[PDB]
């Protein structure tokens, strides 16, 4: 399927144990997509002071359209040293590995895969 319904656990930035997906734009997009397929991906909501506490390159989920079955349609955009790889809508959050952190909420998304 071109899209997959996921429910992503929303993590507090200070709880995250693994603060990025890897060391290059191509690697972090690859690993993010793998962890989304495997159900091992969390979401951190972006506010003042959040991104400097995480590791670059960043992977964002961004709104791709204006929401089937309560799932916002999203796609992946990476960022490294202020350059983005991909073009999309509003940021819903930054993706990180999930390794058993307790979430505060869930974010229903339809991931363009």
CA atoms within 13 A on the CB side of 110: 13
Contacts of 71 (CB under 8 A, 6+ apart): 5, 6, 108, 109, 110
Q: Which residues of 17-39 are buried (b: 16+ CB within 10 A; e: fewer)?
A: eeebbeeebeebbebbbebbeee
CA distance linking residue 109 with residue 6, whole number of Å: 5
Experimental method of this PDB entry? X-ray
Is domain 3-112 given the CATH code 2.60.40 in the classification?
no
My answer on whether omega of the bond before 46 falls inside 30° of 0, hence cis, is no
Resolution rounded to one decimal, in angstroms: 1.5
**Which candidate, 37, 82, 3, 67, places its Cα nearest to that of 95?**
37
CB 16 within 8 A of CB 100: no
Cα 92–55–45 angle (5° rounding)?
Answer: 20
DSSP state of 58: E
């Amino acid at each position: 399927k071109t899209h997959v319904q996921l429910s992503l656990p929303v993590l507090q930035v200070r709880d995250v144990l693994v603060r990025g997906f890897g060391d290059s734009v191509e690697e972090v997009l690859s690993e993010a997509r793998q962890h989304l397929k495997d159900g091992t991906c969390g979401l951190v909501e972006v506010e003042k002071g959040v991104l400097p506490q995480l590791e670059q390159p960043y992977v964002f989920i961004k709104r791709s359209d204006a929401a089937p079955h309560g799932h916002v349609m999203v796609e992946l955009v990476a960022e490294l040293e202020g350059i983005q790889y991909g073009r999309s809508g509003e940021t819903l959050g930054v993706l990180v590995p999930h390794v058993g952190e307790i979430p505060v909420a869930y974010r229903k998304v339809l991931l363009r895969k």
